[PDB]
């Protein structure tokens, strides 16, 4: 399955991921993509901001849905 | 004149900081001249560095504001002498004191870091040859934080 | 009445908002050397406003904040040539007394406001008629 | 006509010969600026000082320039490091030669040393001695 | 009678009436023990081209003190340093009262065309004189060049 | 009448000129820098008439042609010292209204003739038989 | 008065400019032209701006235009004055040639120059010996006086 | 037979050539001998210009005869 | 036997020498030790000045003395 996530400069990035996978893990598979390391990264979705041990599966995230990625300052 | 600003002033003035003078202005309270003498065994040795320090209106819920007035080379200083310090921006608490901000700048002097840069380029040359960093602070140290008076 | 916030901390707000933009674009203010830390040497545009013989002409200024700023007004001139009531032909220094911000300053003001009152003074009626030197000079020094 | 001039440059490389060596008590010092400038007009000279004073146990800096008519024209003194004291201008830190005897009744015999000296001795003038002192540390601006 | 010693007097006009090839010197105006001397870079040396500014004093005592001098002009040279100051054998404790002005700038033009770096003055200069004496010599050209351009 | 030349193109004529040997040979003038695409700084050089105090002495100038060149009239000044009348004998510098090319400019008129008055100007009997001082001295500055 | 043809000339150049080239009378001397070329692409001189002067002398069209450069420019065919040496302006002039064609022989030598005839004796020979060095030179020029100079 | 050409300079030079030669030729070898490119070159005598396709026999150019060389005013 | 030598510098080194030995003799091992060459050096013993000829034992120079150097500017 794929998904995305849009940094707020305006950019979209599209990932491979699994249900299985952890915010931890799509996080990592950003940071292959974006050279961005993951304690700067953080990803909310629907309204909700998403913990790195929880799991996709857990949030309801689904084929093609976009999460949004908040910088950390 | 918030009743915190007279209390902090007065015991910053009754027992100073080792290694660093700071007075209000003649005419402004909130506004601060600070003298910070550069660290032993750092490569700014020997300077002494002038700083500006603001207390805002909102203190102590805003941070203070400081900033450097002798130019100097350091990865979490810019060509401006503005500071990237975490104390001074999003990890300000209002318990925190001048005290501590003026002591914490002095640690930062010796303990330069460049992962989080500032003035990138000065920081990503501490990296690459760290070396040649030192004696260029310490070039800069000869010709800008001395002769100060 | 509240306190008053120092010169230099003021144009590091002054600077910051210089960069990033957000308004009208007819105005445009920076540092002049970048590098300068007494922040003293500044370079303003105004764009020329419609209707006008100024119109579409871009002016480059040079201001200076002194000592005292913003409690006292900074000196500013026009270094692309330019027919203005208060503005001197062979200088291009301003007229304090010509300008109300300037005449009548006070320290809740800014350089984008006094960019901003300068093109509103284009748009003057005793001004936009005037008979303007031709684009591309200015005068030296 | 009474005796012999030095001229300028003989008598300031003569001042500062004596400036390195030793001369005196120590309360006063003089030397170059520049150590290499060779007009030999920008001099550093430095006060410590007197007993019994207000001014007392504070070193002083001080700047004096001697000019093309020197030592028939007196040279000009400037405090740097802030001091409250008659004739010194408290913006700037120049002397005022008028309230300076050595220097309102300048003598070619007169050199920077003496100058130094005069300004300390009226450190101890009853007029000087208690006025009050700004801050140590601080000083003027340029 | 006579100004003041008739020695400086009889040695001045000798020195107008006959001068030194090389040395221009000529008294102040304002003081007669006072000469302003210009000394023409002697060829075969790093100087040549270059014209030296130099300050001559007869102090009271002399005959019997040596004559003060100094350069005004800048120059690399062992015996030189910083602020113009000579050291020279004869101008200390090697002076004879039956020494003349003009032997002295004689003496002065002549260390002009052989440096020895025997003597201390000047230390950096001397041991470099030592160290590279190419690029000493090329050193007191490029000074020659600089301040003795536009002197005179 | 006629059509003007403007200051850059005139000014490298007067320099081809004055490398090219043409005429007299009592004067000689040329650029300072000869990098200097300004070409505002000229040094000039006047040899001593005959029959005067000034003979065969070589006399070098510095002559500055500013922005309105030709137009406007040059500015002269000795370096090798003088005792001529209009010519100050602290600095140096020419007075324009004592010599006449100067002090009647005309946009015909070139460095070279400057120079050439000067030199006519030291045969006049106000200052033929002035004394002059010793060979070699100049001012500062 | 004056003559037609630098009338005509005039007032062709103003009305179809020569694309990359600015050029426009003074306004106290119609003879007098302020010219600013634009640094050719795929050369040294590339994001520079260069400015020139041309004069028409008063034997124009018989005689040549007369035109040199106001930028310091490194170019085996102009000098430290910024005088140039081109065929046109000189011996290979002739009376039916235009101002346009004298500044697109300008432009066209900023892209080819040409080291056979050396003005610059000096920058020819660097460009003959060593175009790599020569070349990084004249863009090196071009960045420090043809910009930030306008 | 040996002819020269004097300059605008003032300047002699002599080369060796026969009547067989042509201006061209001569043209040419003054090149030779100092460089000027031959289409720089106009040679002058006896109030002729001389063209290259001709010979110094044509021209009547005996022995030892001088030419005046003019060059092209070419600026720079 | 051991002798002194004091500069006016302030510093004092001790030779070790034989009462036949010359001054010429004290001046070298004097500068093999403080590299001072011996024509710089002038000696002075006993308000006299020792000479380069002569002995430790004319000048009657005995053990653990004190000699005094004076260098020679020039």
């Known amino acids: 399955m794929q998904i995305f996530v849009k940094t707020l400069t305006?950019?979209?990035?599209?990932?491979?991921?699994?249900?299985?996978?952890?915010?931890?893990?799509?996080?990592?598979?950003?940071?292959?993509?974006?050279?961005?390391?993951?304690?700067?990264?953080?990803?909310?979705?629907?309204?909700?901001?998403?913990?790195?041990?929880?799991?996709?599966?857990?949030?309801?995230?689904?084929?093609?849905?976009?999460?949004?990625?908040?910088?950390?300052? | 004149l918030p009743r915190r600003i007279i209390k902090e002033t007065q015991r910053l003035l009754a027992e100073p900081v080792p290694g660093i003078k700071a007075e209000p202005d003649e005419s402004n309270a909130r506004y601060f001249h600070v003298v910070i003498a550069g660290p032993q065994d750092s490569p700014f040795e020997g300077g002494t560095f002038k700083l500006e320090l603001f207390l805002p209106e909102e203190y102590p819920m805003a941070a203070p504001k400081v900033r450097f007035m002798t130019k100097i080379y350091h990865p979490n200083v810019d060509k401006l002498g503005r500071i990237k310090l975490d104390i001074l921006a999003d990890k300000w608490?209002?318990?925190?004191?001048?005290?501590?901000?003026?002591?914490?700048?002095?640690?930062?002097?010796?303990?330069?870091?460049?992962?989080?840069?500032?003035?990138?380029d000065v920081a990503e040359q501490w990296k690459t040859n760290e070396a040649q960093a030192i004696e260029t602070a310490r070039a800069w140290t000869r010709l800008y934080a001395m002769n100060n008076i | 009445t509240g306190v008053k916030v120092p010169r230099n901390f003021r144009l590091l707000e002054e600077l910051e908002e210089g960069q990033k933009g957000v308004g009208d674009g007819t105005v445009s203010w920076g540092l002049e050397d970048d590098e300068d830390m007494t922040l003293t040497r500044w370079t303003g545009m105004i764009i020329g406003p419609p209707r006008t013989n100024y119109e579409n002409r871009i002016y480059s200024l040079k201001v200076e904040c002194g000592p005292k700023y913003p409690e006292a007004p900074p000196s500013v001139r026009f270094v692309t040539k330019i027919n203005m009531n208060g503005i001197?032909?062979?200088?291009?220094?301003?007229?304090?007394?010509?300008?109300?911000?300037?005449?009548?300053?006070?320290?809740?003001?800014?350089?984008?406001?006094?960019?901003?009152?300068?093109?509103?003074?284009?748009?003057?009626?005793?001004?936009?008629?005037?008979?303007?030197?031709?684009?591309?000079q200015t005068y030296n020094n």
């Open chain 1, 10 to 73: 305006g950019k979209t990035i599209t990932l491979e991921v699994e249900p299985s996978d952890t915010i931890e893990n799509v996080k990592a598979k950003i940071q292959d993509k974006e050279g961005i390391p993951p304690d700067q990264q953080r990803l909310i979705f629907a309204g909700k901001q998403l913990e790195d041990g929880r799991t996709l599966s857990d949030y309801n995230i689904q084929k093609e849905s976009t999460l949004h990625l908040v910088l950390r300052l």
């Open chain 2, 93 to 120: 608490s209002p318990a925190l004191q001048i005290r501590t901000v003026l002591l914490s700048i002095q640690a930062l002097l010796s303990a330069p870091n460049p992962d989080d840069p500032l003035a990138n």
């Open chain 3, 88 to 136: 001197n032909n062979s200088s291009g220094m301003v007229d304090a007394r010509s300008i109300p911000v300037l005449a009548k300053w006070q320290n809740s003001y800014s350089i984008k406001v006094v960019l901003q009152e300068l093109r509103r003074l284009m748009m003057s009626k005793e001004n936009m008629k005037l008979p303007q030197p031709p684009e591309g």
